Design a protein around this ligand. Structure first.
Ligand code: BCL
Ligand code: BCL
Ligand code: BCL
Ligand SMILES: C/C=C1/c2cc3[nH]c4c(c3C)C(=O)[C@H](C(=O)OC)c4c3nc(cc4[nH]c(cc(n2)[C@@H]1C)c(C(C)=O)c4C)[C@@H](C)[C@@H]3CCC(=O)OC/C=C(\C)CCC[C@H](C)CCC[C@H](C)CCCC(C)C
Ligand SMILES: C/C=C1/c2cc3[nH]c4c(c3C)C(=O)[C@H](C(=O)OC)c4c3nc(cc4[nH]c(cc(n2)[C@@H]1C)c(C(C)=O)c4C)[C@@H](C)[C@@H]3CCC(=O)OC/C=C(\C)CCC[C@H](C)CCC[C@H](C)CCCC(C)C
Ligand SMILES: CC(C)=CCC/C(C)=C/CC/C(C)=C/CC/C(C)=C/CC/C(C)=C/CC/C(C)=C/CC/C(C)=C/CC/C(C)=C/COP(=O)(O)OP(=O)(O)O
Ligand SMILES: CC(C)=CCC/C(C)=C/CC/C(C)=C/CC/C(C)=C/CC/C(C)=C/CC/C(C)=C/CC/C(C)=C/CC1=C(C)C(=O)c2ccccc2C1=O
Ligand code: HEC
Ligand code: HEC
Ligand code: HEC
Ligand SMILES: CC(C)=CCC/C(C)=C/C=C\C(C)=C\C=C\C(C)=C\C=C/C=C(C)/C=C/C=C(\C)CC/C=C(\C)CCCC(C)C
Ligand SMILES: CCCCCCCC/C=C\CCCCCCCCOC(=O)[C@H](O)CO
Ligand SMILES: [Fe+2]
Lengths: 323, 273, 243, 332
């Protein structure tokens, strides 16, 4: 057994490395310290961290949104510290309950929601500059930045794009643990069972697919950690027996294989497609489809089952039935 | 037929059972005793789905469904067309799953690598058993399992979740969902990082393992490490079903109400009620 | 009237469904499956045009590699069948076949980002050390699979780029040499390093380094592959069936 | 935190849809015992004699009965409504024709309401029916009533805590939560859906594509309606002690026929009945009840599903007194 795959038996210590970026070396802040127990399953050095304008703007915009959310939650329990700590999972900030269309809703009925979402949008955009500029500063490709952008795009879809396309701020996601959970069921009921949205199934396949891939890939590199398989950058430019045995494991199992580089393109593509599929589904929702189940019924795809208990006519359809 | 670096690895040995009898290749596929048994259960399983589907009202792939028995049949035998076909296909499915896993152990031993992949493959096989065997046994009938159909089994997942009012509040569900999100997030981070180092754009130099840890120490203040992200990613992915297995097996055998009300252990503590 | 309705019984959500399948299969079959073919191709016994990397410390590489030399395999086919297994004609650990195989990596030293040798023993990396609380293996016996003491640990080789020990160096008993062993093949106890991959006598034929205080990418491959070949070849029983 | 096995499970849909009830035996046992307290029918009495419209002085509903038949109902009503206070809960002891006590004038309207349910709402109560006990359970204040705002506890025979009191504003969310099966839905489905007939419980379209003229801007209903419907469906599910697969195939909540159970249609008549009882019988009673019975908006106590069901899909597990008291309905 390779005990190194479970934990680091002998941890090494040394002088902390600093790779210079094109800018912002002076904006790295913090004295690094070393956790023994964190070092058993990862690197022991915590910190330092880079600040920068975009990272600072992210904290300011984001703390503004969070402060707006928590204050409104504290008012829902009338500023009782006990109940707030008690009912915290149930408190929330909601979008407008009445139908004002696209008009900016009142503060007591969705105005605070729209304003926290604005600051959250500014916080996400600031953080993407950081994720993108840090890669350019270190001479790296923007592979993470563009995966991040697809997640930000999906948040914009359920946040403001779909509400604008249908023309109502009432369709947006509330802030809160249970309240944002409750939105999921109301958004599926309203639009005819999301199980019958094909992009729903696409986003589910890719989300499951990221679980399959990281389980197979993570385990594969652990199985070839005896040959330095984790040193993947140099395994790409100079193939070793670690990724030769890894490719042949999968070639001898499923009849084909990838490379140590391309398996990352699969994983980066599957994660990306979770958001791309989910975004297209929200954009089509409500705008061109009103009931995904009947949409599948229209195209003949819906499954049907025999009656177990006897069929039940709609009583509203009966003669003389009340309204 | 062979990869340019394949021939030196094509030796005998590493088998669990069979010896040299099944130790050979068919094209790129390795066989072994468990490759034979895998094809046995797959052929038997695909046959049973074919004969049962012909008895049904449709050949539409989205409309075909092979369902378990009524609740009243319990854990006993069921008529072939009233749940029996489902019973046999389930047995074939498990055989093909376990054979596929043990086949992977043999390929691991011949390559001289660890058994991390077949061990990880036991996680989805275990969760499949929780849905089709373990939870039905606790509930008393096989009819509590899901049907074999492209669009029909979604309706099982749907009605099941609503049987408990709001399945989102299931605490084992929240944990299984949290791992599903973080794993798909981490795979996009990690896959993007390796590609960002090897493809810096234009005609720039390929960066280093020092550049890897420097990026994530800059962004979030910590970098877990090259090998450690592979132990982490396998931990995150495995715990989708490991933690989810709790919430599924508790729904019914250990809890018959709606899952929001389960949270009264906290909300109904007398000193803040 | 309906939003999204088109000619015939067609609608916009219907059209995007075809477009989504076309894009997915286009990326999968025409790009991802061709990036999968940058190593190991063409087959022996659809391909993308070459990819060229600019290396961090001078020079370039273009994949897949075409080596000016190729090795002669000490393997005998077991039968004439196209998919029959091969069989070693000598000692598979020193001939490097099967699980003992290594790749023809560059005979260059793997480098840190600032140009120094990446994998070096602690006698060279004097600014490195073992973390407080972990066992210092230097001075502990190495016990092989047969239970015999194969030698004694003399140093640890650290990765100066990742701060991660990757090998132990031990004096081979009765052989006047030192061999390296990957820490994955070591079970580190408080008083002994347990190694079950090979027997004690098989430590004598561990591939040797050209230099004492550095190692190349191919030497690292050769050393790792020798212990892994022992998982299948250390004893005659390991090549046979488990049951 | 958890309930031991085994569990009682029924099947309400085709095999392999996972439709049906999921019950805990210990809960069902406690409700069966509680509902077994239904006083048995009184013994039959003499059918011949004058009608009390002749015999008595101020009989306005039960006038066709004989004296023996009429005093029988007067005893069952007392058993069902005010058994501890006896006859004098509604009667001046020295003149039984006097309307000097407020429960007298309310009881007559209740005698009319009870006949109305058994005669005009058989699409729901069928041949089981309701008597005074179905709601009162032996007390003049029924245990499970609603006001125009959420109240805790649900059983008004239980002492409320401080935060549970409707005056304590910091506990509103919990008062909303427990009436929607502990969910965080921010809507009171009783005033919205069961106090009157103003709102539409259905929110799902019956078209595959968005219909032009009701799909954009202020033409649209807000998505808040979907939450509120979901809130009524959690309150309905809890008050009957059931889940939705008792009524819907969750494949398509909006579809009837094979997608709905016969109980869903009975539930539809149950909503039209609650509104008729609240609008035409129970709410106007605030002019007859004392101020100590009214809510903070001057409202009289009103009825939802739980008033009769009290956690069971059928009130009293189907126990009936219809054949024993024909004077309660149906009325020819
Ligand atoms: C408790 C949770 C539910 C569940 C809930 C859902 C939901 C919800 C969704 C799916 C979706 C899918 N599920 Mg399901 N699913 C469960 C368990 C299963 C089992 C099983 C052995 O138990 C199987 C075979 C599947 C298979 C599938 C696919 C039809 C589809 C895409 C998955 C995917 O990409 O995975 C990752 C794997 C890959 C990316 C690799 C490729 C896998 C290929 C596509 C598998 C084809 C299987 C096909 C049915 C043929 C089977 C064998 C035949 C005999 C030849 N699920 C359990 C029972 N599943 C989605 C969908 O679109 O369904 C129509 C969807 O919306
Ligand atoms: C009853 C409830 C419904 C339901 C309702 C919905 C709805 C509604 C939606 C989904 C969506 C999704 N659902 Mg569904 N879903 C149900 C059943 C399922 C089942 C199942 C087995 O039954 C599965 C596998 C899934 C899974 C999935 C996901 C694959 C998919 C995409 C969302 C996602 O990953 O978000 C995880 C990722 C994110 C939320 C992105 C976050 C990115 C940002 C950058 C993070 C910012 C962090 C920062 C710190 C925040 C600061 C905040 C401060 C305030 C400033 N659902 C049922 C049928 N589901 C979506 C979809 O695809 O629709 C087509 C969608 O809109
Ligand atoms: C109204 C319906 C409910 C709901 C009902 C349920 C139910 C019911 C269950 C889940 C479960 C799950 N839900 Mg859901 N869920 C809902 C909402 C969501 C949302 C969301 C955004 O709201 C998300 C992210 C999810 C996500 C998840 C998953 C993380 C989780 C585990 C899936 C699983 O077991 O797959 C199982 C997958 C397998 C068994 C696959 C096994 C594969 C085998 C080993 C190999 C197959 C090979 C194949 C046949 C080969 C074909 C050959 C070809 C060549 C490829 N749900 C809604 C609210 N959900 C489960 C769970 O764990 O809950 C705690 C569960 O039981
Ligand atoms: C938490 C960890 C997870 C994870 C991980 C890993 N996943 C692995 C491995 C690891 C580590 C492998 O090493 C192995 C492999 O080599 O991969 C390439 C494998 C594989 N993951 C597959 C599918 C997969 N994984 C899912 C789930 C997760 N995986 C989660 C996320 C899902 C979901 C979510 O639906 C799917 C569909 C196959 C492609 C493959 C097995 C092939 C097989 O065993 O062949 C043998 C069997 C057959 C070829 C078919 C047998 C047909 C039967 C007899 C008759 C049909 C029965 C069937 C029930 C009918 C269904 C109807 C349908 C509508 C309901
Ligand atoms: C399919 C692909 C997916 C995916 C992908 C990727 N996801 C990425 C990246 C990629 C590629 C990055 O590059 C980036 C990153 O850096 O990685 C290290 C990132 C991130 N994914 C986060 C969270 C997350 N991703 C989710 C979803 C998915 N992601 C899906 C699954 C979910 C879910 C499921 O809910 C969550 C919660 C953050 C950690 C981070 C952004 C931080 C931010 O934008 O902060 C902006 C906000 C702040 C800085 C606020 C700071 C508040 C402090 C406490 C202030 C004090 C408050 C005070 C008390 C108030 C009064
Ligand atoms: C050469 C070689 C070996 C190639 C191998 C490559 C290979 C096998 C790659 C595998 C990786 C791939 C391609 C993964 C893609 C699969 C993924 C990620 C997801 C599939 C998910 C999936 C099937 C979603 C379907 C969505 C759902 C639920 C739709 C239901 C409703 C439906 C079908 C409506 C259709 C109505 C319409 C528009 C028309 C019907 O007429
Ligand atoms: C003909 C006959 C009967 C023969 C008998 C012998 C026998 C047993 C034959 C088997 C026949 C069967 C059943 C074949 C079916 C095999 C299956 C299940 C194929 C499914 C393929 C699918 C959908 C896989 C999903 C995962 C996926 C999208 C993978 C694409 C990317 C790949 C290839 C990842 C695998 C992969 C990973 C995970 C690495 O980490 C890695 C590291 C370094 C180098 C290479 C790799 C690598 O290739
Ligand atoms: C909860 C209500 C209630 C209870 C309990 C009750 N009464 Fe009645 N009583 C009424 C009402 C209402 C009427 C008028 C009925 C009508 O108009 O037909 C009435 C009418 C009568 C009358 C008719 C007298 C007349 O001339 O109008 C008599 C006699 C009578 N009750 C006797 C009894 C007896 C005997 C008991 C108990 C053993 C009793 N009451 C308890 C409410 C009640
Ligand atoms: C005992 C009866 C009953 C129970 C329990 C029940 N439902 Fe309902 N539900 C109905 C009826 C009846 C209607 C139709 C209302 C109407 O016609 O005004 C309905 C309507 C709905 C609708 C909207 C239908 C449309 O066309 O918009 C949804 C969604 C719904 N129910 C979901 C649920 C959910 C979710 C649950 C539980 C978690 C549940 N139901 C439990 C009887 C029930
Ligand atoms: C005032 C009386 C009353 C009220 C209020 C009431 N119920 Fe009923 N309900 C009954 C009675 C009595 C039965 C018994 C009918 C039977 O035996 O079939 C019944 C039966 C049912 C059934 C049939 C269950 C089965 O197993 O067949 C359903 C479903 C139901 N009620 C739902 C509701 C709904 C929905 C509401 C309110 C929205 C409600 N109940 C409120 C009196 C009531
Ligand atoms: C203490 C520490 C370390 C952290 C504290 C975190 C904390 C306790 C937060 C407090 C409460 C919690 C947990 C809240 C959770 C909220 C959740 C889960 C929210 C989830 C989803 C919400 C979403 C997606 C909202 C999206 C909203 C938008 C995208 C709005 C977009 C708005 C615009 C574009 C404005 C343009 C229009 C203009 C004319 C006004
Ligand atoms: C992707 C989420 C990862 C979360 C990890 C956060 C760990 C917190 C680390 C903070 C480092 C800040 C600098 C340390 C020195 C303090 C001065
Ligand atoms: Fe990797």
């Amino acid at each position: 057994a390779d005990y190194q795959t479970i934990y680091t038996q002998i941890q090494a210590r040394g002088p902390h490395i600093t790779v210079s970026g094109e800018w912002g070396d002076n904006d790295r802040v913090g004295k690094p310290f070393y956790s023994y127990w964190l070092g058993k399953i990862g690197d022991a050095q915590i910190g330092p961290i880079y600040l920068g304008a975009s990272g600072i703007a992210a904290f300011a915009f984001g703390s503004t949104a969070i402060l707006i959310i928590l204050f409104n939650m504290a008012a829902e329990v009338h500023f009782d510290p006990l109940q707030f700590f008690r009912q915290f999972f149930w408190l929330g900030l909601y979008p407008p309950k009445a139908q004002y269309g696209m008009g900016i809703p009142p503060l007591h009925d969705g105005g605070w929601w729209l304003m926290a979402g604005l600051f959250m949008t500014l916080s996400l955009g600031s953080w993407w500059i950081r994720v993108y500029s840090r890669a350019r500063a270190l001479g790296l490709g923007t592979h993470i930045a563009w995966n991040f952008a697809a997640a930000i795009f999906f948040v914009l879809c359920i946040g403001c794009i779909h509400p604008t396309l249908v023309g109502s701020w009432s369709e947006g996601v509330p802030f809160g643990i249970w309240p944002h959970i409750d939105w999921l069921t109301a958004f599926s009921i309203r639009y005819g069972n999301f199980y019958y949205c094909p992009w729903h199934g696409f986003s589910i396949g890719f989300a499951y697919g990221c679980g399959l891939l990281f389980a197979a890939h993570g385990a594969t590199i652990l199985a070839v950690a005896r040959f330095g398989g984790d040193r993947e950058i140099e395994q790409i430019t100079d193939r070793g027996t670690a990724v030769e045995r890894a490719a042949l494991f999968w070639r001898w199992t499923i009849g084909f294989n990838a490379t140590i580089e391309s398996v990352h393109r699969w994983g980066w593509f599957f994660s990306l497609m979770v958001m791309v599929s989910a975004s297209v589904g929200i954009l089509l929702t409500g705008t061109f489809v009103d009931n995904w189940y009947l949409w599948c019924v229209k195209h003949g795809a819906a499954p049907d089952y025999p009656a177990y208990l006897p069929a039940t006519p709609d009583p509203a359809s009966l003669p003389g039935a009340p309204k | 037929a062979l990869l340019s670096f394949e021939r030196k690895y094509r030796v005998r040995g590493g088998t669990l059972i069979g010896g040299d009898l099944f130790d050979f290749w068919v094209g790129p596929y390795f066989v072994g005793f468990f490759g034979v048994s895998a094809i046995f259960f797959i052929f038997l399983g695909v046959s049973l789905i074919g004969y049962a589907a012909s008895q049904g009202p449709t050949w539409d792939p989205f409309a075909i469904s092979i369902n378990p028995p009524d609740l009243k049949y319990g854990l006993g035998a069921a008529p072939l067309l009233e749940g029996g076909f489902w019973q046999a296909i389930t047995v074939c499915a498990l055989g093909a799953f376990i054979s596929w896993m043990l086949r992977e152990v043999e390929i691991s031993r011949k390559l001289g690598i660890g058994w991390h992949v077949p061990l990880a493959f036991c996680v989805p096989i275990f969760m499949f058993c929780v849905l089709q065997v373990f939870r039905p046994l606790l509930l008393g009938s096989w009819g509590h399992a899901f049907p074999y159909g492209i669009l029909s089994h979604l309706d099982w997942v749907n009605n099941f979740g609503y049987q408990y009012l709001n399945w989102h509040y299931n605490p084992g569900h929240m944990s299984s969902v949290s791992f599903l999100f973080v794993n798909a997030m981490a795979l996009g981070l990690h896959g993007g990082l390796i590609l960002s180092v090897a493809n810096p754009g234009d005609g720039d130099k390929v960066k280093t393992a020092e550049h890897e840890n420097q990026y994530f120490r800059d962004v979030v203040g910590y970098s877990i490490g090259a090998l450690s992200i592979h132990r982490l990613g396998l931990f995150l992915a495995s715990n989708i079903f490991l933690t989810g297995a709790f919430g599924t097996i508790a729904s019914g055998p250990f809890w018959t109400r709606g899952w929001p009300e389960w949270w009264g252990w906290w909300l109904d503590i007398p000193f803040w009620s | 009237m309906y939003h999204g309705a088109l000619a015939q019984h067609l609608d916009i959500a219907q059209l995007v469904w075809y477009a989504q399948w076309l894009v997915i299969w286009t990326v999968v079959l025409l790009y991802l499956r061709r990036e999968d073919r940058r190593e190991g191709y063409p087959l022996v016994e659809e391909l993308p045009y070459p990819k060229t990397f600019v290396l961090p410390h001078g020079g370039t590489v273009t994949v897949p590699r075409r080596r000016p030399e190729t090795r002669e395999l000490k393997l005998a086919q077991t039968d004439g069948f196209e998919g029959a297994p091969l069989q070693p004609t000598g000692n598979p650990l020193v001939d490097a076949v099967g699980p003992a195989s290594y790749a023809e990596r560059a005979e260059v030293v793997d480098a840190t980002v600032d140009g120094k040798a990446k994998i070096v023993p602690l006698r060279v990396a004097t600014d490195f050390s073992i973390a407080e609380g972990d066992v210092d293996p230097r001075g502990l016996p190495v016990v092989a699979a047969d239970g015999v003491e194969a030698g004694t640990v003399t140093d640890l080789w650290v990765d100066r780029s990742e701060h991660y020990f990757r090998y132990l160096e031990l004096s081979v008993a009765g052989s006047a040499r030192t061999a390296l062993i990957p820490l994955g093949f070591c079970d580190v106890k408080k008083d002994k390093i347990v190694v079950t991959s090979i027997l004690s006598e098989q430590f004598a034929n561990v591939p040797r380094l050209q230099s004492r205080d550095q190692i190349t990418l191919r030497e690292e491959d050769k050393v790792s592959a020798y212990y892994a070949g022992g998982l299948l070849y250390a004893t005659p029983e390991r090549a046979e069936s488990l049951l | 935190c958890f309930e031991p096995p085994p569990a009682t499970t029924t099947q309400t849909g085709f095999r392999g849809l996972s439709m049906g009830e999921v019950l805990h035996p210990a809960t069902v046992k406690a409700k069966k015992e509680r509902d077994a307290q239904y006083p048995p029918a009184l013994a039959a009495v003499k059918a011949e004699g004058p009608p009390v419209s002749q015999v008595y002085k101020n009989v306005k509903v039960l006038g066709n009965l004989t004296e023996a038949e009429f005093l029988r109902t007067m005893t069952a009503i007392t058993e069902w409504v005010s058994p501890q206070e006896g006859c004098t809960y509604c009667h001046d002891e020295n003149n039984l024709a006097s309307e000097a006590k407020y429960p007298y004038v309310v009881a007559r309207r209740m005698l009319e309401m009870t006949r109305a349910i058994n005669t005009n709402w058989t699409q729901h109560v069928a041949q089981t029916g309701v008597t005074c006990y179905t709601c009162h359970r032996g007390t003049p204040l029924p245990p499970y009533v609603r006001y125009l705002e959420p109240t805790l506890p649900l059983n008004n025979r239980e002492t409320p805590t401080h935060v549970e009191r409707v005056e304590t504003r910091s506990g509103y969310v919990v008062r909303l939560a427990k009436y929607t099966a502990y969910s965080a839905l921010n809507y009171d489905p009783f005033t919205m859906f069961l106090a009157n007939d103003k709102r539409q419980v259905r929110v799902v379209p019956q078209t595959a594509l968005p219909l032009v003229g009701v799909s954009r801007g202020k033409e649209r209903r807000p998505l808040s309606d979907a939450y509120a419907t979901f809130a009524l469906m959690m309150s309905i599910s809890d008050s009957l002690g059931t889940n939705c697969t008792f009524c819907h195939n969750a494949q398509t909540f909006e579809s009837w026929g094979k997608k709905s159970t016969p109980q869903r249609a009975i539930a539809w008549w149950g909503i039209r009945m609650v509104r008729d009882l609240n609008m035409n019988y129970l709410a106007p009673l605030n002019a007859s009840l004392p101020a100590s019975r009214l809510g903070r908006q001057g409202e009289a106590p009103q009825a939802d599903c739980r008033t009769c069901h009290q956690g069971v899909t059928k009130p009293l597990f189907g126990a009936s007194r219809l054949k024993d008291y024909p004077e309660l309905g149906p009325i020819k």
